[PDB]
């Protein structure tokens, strides 16, 4: 996901990375928006389904 949110075949958008090197820290979007949400917590399930 990360690798590909980051693959821009069109004009690039503002990617404001996070302090952690962990994938999905950035906030791509002209309105920001965390990609940290689509991380992967098993106790929450914050990224994938339900």
């Amino acid at each position: 996901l990360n690798d590909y949110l980051l693959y821009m075949y069109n004009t690039r958008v503002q990617v404001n990375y996070g302090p952690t090197g962990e994938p999905l820290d950035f906030q791509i979007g002209r309105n920001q928006y965390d990609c940290n949400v689509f991380r992967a917590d098993f106790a929450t399930g914050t990224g994938y389904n339900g």
Binding site: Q14, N16, R30, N31, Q32, Y33
Partner: protein, 349 residues
Amino acid sequence: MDTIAARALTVMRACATLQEARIVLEANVMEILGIAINRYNGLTLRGVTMRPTSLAQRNEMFFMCLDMMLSAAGINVGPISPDYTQHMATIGVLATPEIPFTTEAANEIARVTGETSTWGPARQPYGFFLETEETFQPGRWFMRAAQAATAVVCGPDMIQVSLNAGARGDVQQIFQGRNDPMMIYLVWRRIENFAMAQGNSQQTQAGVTVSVGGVDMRAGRIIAWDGQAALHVRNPTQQNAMVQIQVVFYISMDKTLNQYPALTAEIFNVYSFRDHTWHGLRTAIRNRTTLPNMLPPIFPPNDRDSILTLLLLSTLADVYTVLRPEFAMHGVNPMPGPLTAAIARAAYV
């Protein structure tokens, strides 16, 4: 400098737009905050989000508004909170040209700097003879020894002349020496029934005339007086007369509450309570200014810095309302209840 103040106001008013989480913003707003927050976080190193949701994200933003609000008014509050620390770099952000400002904000600042750097005639608030030490009973005969005409104050906007039968004389001196009027609007009446030195009722006969700078004026009509001309009162009547001259209102170059559009409400807004966290924050900020920290200044300020501050704080107050921030403040012990008219009353020292 003015450009800086407008940007700060623009940003604050923009942060107020965030009433909900998923609401669609005006393309204009996103474009602005997108640049503002991007550059602020660069020189401050804080984490402000365009779409705050948590609380820390909400505080972070409010803190930013505070940092800017202060940088613009040129204030340094110092250590007033364990959570907050003022960054002086905030002024550098408000000067970055690439950060636009609204037409509304520009026209708002131009108005403050405008009237604040010059003077103008305005209806003064209180009575003319307000700063007087002595006052006489209204409608009572009083003739100063050796005079045929004796003008004397009897109210905050009232004077009464006591004329003898066939007496005449100038009165303009009782007014002069006070304030610095440009025009004093008058309206004289005949005291048809007054008390004598002893107590008996005495009538004033029709015929008593008053003339300004020469020309004779009617009774009960407003009279534009320049304060310099000859205010002459005559009494061709064969009895004792008494007339009252009223200063309905007067104009002077002293700044009033109408120097800036609805400045009154803007002030009231800042001086309002909201909650303890606000009360203290607003107070602590005013301790750096010439303005009374928790009670409306009896006298409307007149300097750029004063008014500018009131507006930035009035707006920051609104930003407070919408963001609902929660943080500690030195010396402030917040009562977590619903808040009543009583609790607010007590908060004002």
